[PDB]
Amino acid sequence: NTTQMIPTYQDVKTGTTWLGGPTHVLQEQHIPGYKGHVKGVQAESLHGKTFARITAECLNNRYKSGFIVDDEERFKTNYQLEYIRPNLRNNNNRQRDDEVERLELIKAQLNSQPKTIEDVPPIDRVPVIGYQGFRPVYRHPLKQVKGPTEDEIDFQARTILELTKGQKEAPKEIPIVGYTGFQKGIKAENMFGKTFKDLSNASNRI
């Protein structure tokens, strides 16, 4: 924890200590070789994180103890624990949001042109001249259209503008191609022809 917490931004910028730094004024260390109990070495068995940082972690009491762990800090893997971005010197992508926005705008422009309430041209009241079919006689000849109601057209609208710099998050996060895990139910419901990119989104969305 000390590695990502200490050398803070205020300390690194216009401060005594740089990236690596003799970070001894900020908090206490034990100057390599030392014979004594440091309250955390033989119990928690810290890894890497050189002896100075080992002693610093114990002294500043971030720590963890016990024979019981609960879920969240239980389930971390060393890969993400060590290779966690670049963090502390100077202060990811904006994506997934632009294409989801493309998505709702396509459905918006689609359902915004069903020609509600007798707005269709004089043609297409009846089917095409050569249609075959059945053409029942004891039925109203002209087709009747219900169409979407103005409120659902607006339903899409404030949402699509809210995704533009709004509170609702870019949803989920996905892997790219070769991920072999379950990926939550592509097999249970077929979703047969849906562009593995978009399959990830739909299947994780449910």
Binding site: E99, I106, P121, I123, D124, P127, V128, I129, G130, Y131, Q132, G133, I176, V177, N190, F192, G193, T195, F196, K197
Partner: protein
């Protein structure tokens, strides 16, 4: 004032023609109703009504009403002429004799009549495209009869057939070898150019590149539509090196008998990873000649090359094209036939390929399609010949053709013609 007319016969032909027609309308900005959004170039494929709507230069033929009914109830109700969608009543039921001698003989009359009406309007008619699945009785029979009628009527007018042969082992029906051989015999002395578009190869391409593991017919038809657009782009768009349809029969066929060739396209890629690389013209033209990307399930490494005609669309450069062709000629794994010192025809077009929204393809500023004639295509003839022989040895299913006007010896002469074609392939494949 240059036009081309499209014939769409058979179920697969209809549902791929729908596919190409949304693409053409979207690319010319045509609204589904055919009316202009208040904005010459389109003249190749459409004809003006005087004010407003346009009529596509297409005709659809079928005997089974369901697919035509679906088209006429879809979103394009008012695009097509309502009596150019010729529909019959009884399906040929995968029977070649039924579709060649019994039913279609009374429908080809109105097919030729509609062709007459659509052609007399035109002025500088370039030629005809024809779409038909071979593994279907009505498709094969109607296509054959129309080709014979158009040959005796028109003659030298160019006709291009985009046939989808059955996969070597994956097939939908069980009697498709018979009508495949019969249709091949019929069209061999009647068509000018025939393109191989079997399904297994395009299935493999969809699985590998687009990362689609459960594709359907729609995606295949979309890719075929893109290939058609690539072929016909130079006809309606300005380019540094444009070609006409008429500049094919003088370039990709060595002899009058050899006019079956196979296609390929590049790049085919998903929106995941189109933007992670240059899409350099050199690497796209290498992917084009990559054997596993062939649109037909044939191995080019097993035979020599006669000719390759390649279309580029986008912002390609003649320097780049020349440099890539030099590398291709340098490469050793690709060899040409002895009497063909140079075998490359190249065309360049400015307008970038259009991408369909909600589709699978991404938008790329460069694309290329190759049409290649090579000796390796004899393998499909050999395997379908074996398939036909295994059937005809014991006269299986023969009655279902005999009872409807087919003569018994009709199969033997088609077999002899196929054997002669194979022997011609062998003769032309040897060096001097």
């Amino acid at each position: 004032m240059r036009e081309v007319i499209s014939i769409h016969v058979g179920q697969g032909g209809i549902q791929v023609g729908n596919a190409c027609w949304e693409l053409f309308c979207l690319e010319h900005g045509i609204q589904p109703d055919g009316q202009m959004p208040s904005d010459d170039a389109f003249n190749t494929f459409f004809s003006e009504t005087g004010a407003g709507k346009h009529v596509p230069r297409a005709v659809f033929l079928d005997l089974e009403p369901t697919v035509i009914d679906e088209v006429r109830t879809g979103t394009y109700r008012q695009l097509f002429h309502p009596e150019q969608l010729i529909s019959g009543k009884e399906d040929a039921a995968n029977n070649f004799a039924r579709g060649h001698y019994t039913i279609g003989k009374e429908i080809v009359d109105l097919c030729l009549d509609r062709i007459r009406k659509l052609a007399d309007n035109c002025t500088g008619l370039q030629g005809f495209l024809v779409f038909n699945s071979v593994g279907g009785g009505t498709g094969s029979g109607l296509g054959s009869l129309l080709l014979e009628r158009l040959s005796v009527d028109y003659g030298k007018k160019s006709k291009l057939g985009f046939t989808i042969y059955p996969s070597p082992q994956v097939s939908t029906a069980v009697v498709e070898p018979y009508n495949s051989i019969l249709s091949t015999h019929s069209l061999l002395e009647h068509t000018d150019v025939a393109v191989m578009l079997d399904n297994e190869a395009i299935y493999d391409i969809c699985r590998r590149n687009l990362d689609i593991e459960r594709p359907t017919y729609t995606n295949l038809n979309r890719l075929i539509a893109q290939v058609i657009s690539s072929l016909t782009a130079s006809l309606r768009f300005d380019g540094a090196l444009n070609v006409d349809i008429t500049e094919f029969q003088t370039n990709l066929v060595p002899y009058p008998r050899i006019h079956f060739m196979l296609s390929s396209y590049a790049p085919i890629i998903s929106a995941e990873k189109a933007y992670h690389e240059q899409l350099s013209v050199a690497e796209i033209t290498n992917s084009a000649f990559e054997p596993a990307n062939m649109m037909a399930k044939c191995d080019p490494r097993h035979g020599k090359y006669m000719a390759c005609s390649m279309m580029y669309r986008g912002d390609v450069v003649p320097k780049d094209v020349n440099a890539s062709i030099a590398t291709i000629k340098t490469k050793r794994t690709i060899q040409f036939v002895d009497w063909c010192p140079t075998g490359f025809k190249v065309g360049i077009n400015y307008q970038p390929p259009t991408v369909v929204p909600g589709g699978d393809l991404a938008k790329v500023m460069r694309a290329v399609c190759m049409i290649s004639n090579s000796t390796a295509i004899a393998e499909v003839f050999s395997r379908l010949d074996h398939k036909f022989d295994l059937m005809y040895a014991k006269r299986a299913f023969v009655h279902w053709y005999v009872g409807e006007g087919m003569e018994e010896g009709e199969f033997s002469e088609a077999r002899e013609d196929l054997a002669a074609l194979e022997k011609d392939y062998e003769e032309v494949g040897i060096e001097t």
